Write a protein that binds this ligand. Structure first.
Ligand SMILES: NC(=O)c1ccc[n+]([C@@H]2O[C@H](COP(=O)([O-])OP(=O)(O)OC[C@H]3O[C@@H](n4cnc5c(N)ncnc54)[C@H](O)[C@@H]3O)[C@@H](O)[C@H]2O)c1
Ligand SMILES: NC(=O)c1ccc[n+]([C@@H]2O[C@H](COP(=O)([O-])OP(=O)(O)OC[C@H]3O[C@@H](n4cnc5c(N)ncnc54)[C@H](O)[C@@H]3O)[C@@H](O)[C@H]2O)c1
Ligand SMILES: O=C(CCc1ccc(O)c(O)c1)O[C@@H]1C[C@@](O)(C(=O)O)C[C@@H](O)[C@@H]1O
Ligand SMILES: O=C(CCc1ccc(O)c(O)c1)O[C@@H]1C[C@@](O)(C(=O)O)C[C@@H](O)[C@@H]1O
Ligand SMILES: [Mg+2]
Ligand SMILES: [Mg+2]
Lengths: 357, 344
């Protein structure tokens, strides 16, 4: 009934529990125990939906609960917004034994994680992700960060949670465009690391799009296992997680944020990366049709913006524009389920990949 | 020239102590030709030692930027640290850069937390210019900035790649700060090293005169001693707050800048010694060697008459560090409130 993944990285270990109505289970927010305190960090969108339920379930178990409601937005993933959490913790005399609870998506997840890393140089930290993206991505790897006006995720810390609480019910309220955005990263795991999971996704995508409890539970479980594996082997293998992200960054940068969701840009970037793998001679068009066909059924774009031409991509795709830079490093699939980093690929290869679509 | 190698958290870094160290060849190792460096300092230290290190560094093939912050504890803030990030990004410093903390404990703490947080961690070299930061901030990995509702409440544990202690920089340090640092030097002798305390009884006059050879061993020994007790807490380490509970009370009641931290701790150490005899843990004769050595360092031995004992306890709220001998110490859980006022 309950899926469970144990993650052991950077010499610590935490569980990821996945089940519908998990917010109500007995010891759902372990290792929080009766008598301890907790500070829930959430945003203005999620607060009316889930804060009160989470607060009462914790108080039922003997936890003393405070909360802080931040504004909703990537533009609020700032050092100055995170300061407000420190104020809330201090006004309520939260000491080093408190637990910070990230009730929200990846934005709340990153900001609350860095707050838990920094408050008194480190307090306990429990993740409650409410987007599919953050459930299969933010739950593993320890990366926390806020943005700087001159660069995204340039201020943060490596910091692992004590546990991850994934109640599938919270997906019922998630905008359907966000759910497909998350599914782009789900499909990415199939292409770079597990061909059988990709095949499983070919046969259950419709159930996931319908929010089937049993299919969604296994999906999140397997993606967490796959990211945990590729992080445990690395700590440059973790770079394989940027499949479709170089092409996707160009789309996100050139179109402006919020216009294309991150997952939407990654979906078309994975197609373009599959097309770059064919051009070099490592991928078949039939393999590319399986990627295109599965993203189409996730209601994800498979071609880039009409507004953009191949020369709009390359400025964003380069590591830098320095004289000795200007290099294109890509992650390319070798099979469905296998991938490689490929350094210095021709601009002509890239252009052709983009033009083919 | 003294050297301490400290190994904590399965990592290792050196502390080099020598006069004219800023001009030495690889004094700012592991920085090498082709790499970048960002120096963080305050307005006081910039005219004195910036540009000198910059010239030693640029001659050695490293490309150098710097940022000069105002001098003061009030600038150990999250908003000031953001400006460090702004400077690094404006100059396109990537994850391979190195932050250089050229300053006292304030610059050290802020730059350390900036290096811990910038791209989730970049290299970080300490150049402490106060005696306090040489014997305290150079070991233990604590970095932080302040919050208005609490000092050092936003930070990270983050070890430096090296600590570069040029003894020449002490020549410009105000004598009140040098005496303030010596209170913490004396702290190590009382809580963990009796032989060092005796060494201090015979060399205090050399340290006050900035004798290179005495200062080099002094700084070396204090670093070794804290490195030991930091490695032990992996359960002691509370002993380094001897006289700091009393010291906070004086600092809190009188205000910043009026009493320097070491002066507050020095007079607080006496009060802890007199309470240690009151409960029966110290002899009255031993307390005179603590008082006599601090007086010869030009440190206060009496808490100001401007506060009554009843002013002290409100901040102290019972969980104290008290000396057992000169060279050994203990934390004692529940001590009477009446005992502390009787010490005054
Ligand atoms: N390794 C990592 O740490 C990691 C990994 C991936 C992404 N991230 C970061 O995550 C952030 C984006 O993640 P995201 O996809 O969650 O975006 P998001 O946090 O902004 O959430 C998307 C939108 O949907 C709303 N929402 C969230 N849950 C909802 C729910 N149950 N019901 C209704 N609405 C809900 C949110 O309020 C928000 O408006 C990025 O900043 C990214 O840098 C970090
Ligand atoms: N575990 C740790 O990391 C640790 C340890 C001890 C103290 N601290 C923190 O450090 C701060 C206090 O450190 P501090 O005692 O060095 O105070 P400080 O950094 O403010 O320096 C003392 C004063 O003397 C000036 N000065 C420093 N070096 C000079 C030099 N060579 N020449 C001329 N002037 C010089 C400084 O500009 C400053 O005004 C506190 O915030 C404390 O919390 C941290
Ligand atoms: O932020 C990123 C990299 C963004 C990026 C920008 C431009 C590029 O050319 C690129 O290859 C990646 O990825 C996120 C972190 C992630 O790489 C991890 O957890 O290690 C997973 C990924 O899904 C996230 O989007
Ligand atoms: O914890 C502290 C803060 C000093 C303090 C302030 C107020 C108090 O009431 C107190 O008991 C200690 O000590 C600092 C950190 C240190 O313990 C370490 O590096 O581990 C060394 C010590 O010298 C610092 O002052
Ligand atoms: Mg991604
Ligand atoms: Mg101190």
């Amino acid at each position: 009934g309950m899926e469970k993944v144990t993650v052991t990285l950077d010499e610590r270990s935490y569980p990821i529990n996945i089940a519908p109505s998990l917010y109500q289970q007995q010891d759902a927010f372990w290792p929080l125990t009766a008598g301890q305190r907790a500070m829930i960090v959430t945003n203005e969108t999620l607060a009316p939906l889930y804060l009160h339920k989470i607060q009462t379930v914790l108080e039922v178990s003997g936890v003393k609960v405070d909360s802080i409601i931040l504004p909703d937005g990537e533009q609020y993933k700032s050092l100055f917004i995170m300061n407000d959490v420190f104020t809330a913790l201090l006004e309520k005399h939260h000491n080093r034994d408190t637990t910070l609870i990230a009730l929200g998506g990846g934005v709340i997840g990153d900001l609350t994680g860095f707050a838990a890393a920094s408050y008194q140089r480190g307090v306990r930290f429990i993740q409650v992700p409410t987007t599919l993206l953050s459930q299969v991505d933010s739950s593993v790897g320890g990366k926390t960060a806020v943005n700087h006006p001159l660069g995204k995720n340039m201020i943060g810390a490596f910091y692992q949670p004590a546990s991850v609480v994934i109640d599938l019910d919270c997906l019922k309220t998630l905008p359907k465009r966000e759910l497909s955005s998350g599914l782009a990263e789900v499909i990415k795991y199939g292409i770079i690391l597990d061909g059988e999971f990709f095949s499983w996704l070919e046969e259950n995508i419709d159930a996931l799009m319908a929010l089937d409890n049993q299919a969604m539970a296994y999906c999140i479980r397997r993606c967490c296992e796959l990211k945990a594996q590729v992080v445990a082997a690395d700590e440059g293998l973790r770079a394989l997680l940027n499949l479709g992200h170089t092409f996707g960054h160009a789309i996100e940068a050139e179109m402006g944020y919020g216009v294309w969701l991150h997952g939407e840009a990654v979906a078309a970037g994975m197609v373009m990366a599959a097309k770059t793998a064919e051009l070099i001679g490592q991928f078949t068009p039939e393999q590319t049709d399986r990627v295109i066909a599965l993203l189409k059924r996730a209601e994800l774009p498979v071609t880039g913006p009409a507004k953009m031409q191949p020369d709009d991509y390359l400025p964003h795709m380069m590591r830098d524009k320095k004289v000795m830079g200007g290099k294109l490093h890509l992650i390319l699939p070798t099979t469905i389920g296998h991938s490689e980093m490929r350094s210095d690929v021709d601009a002509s290869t890239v252009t052709a990949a983009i033009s083919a679509c």
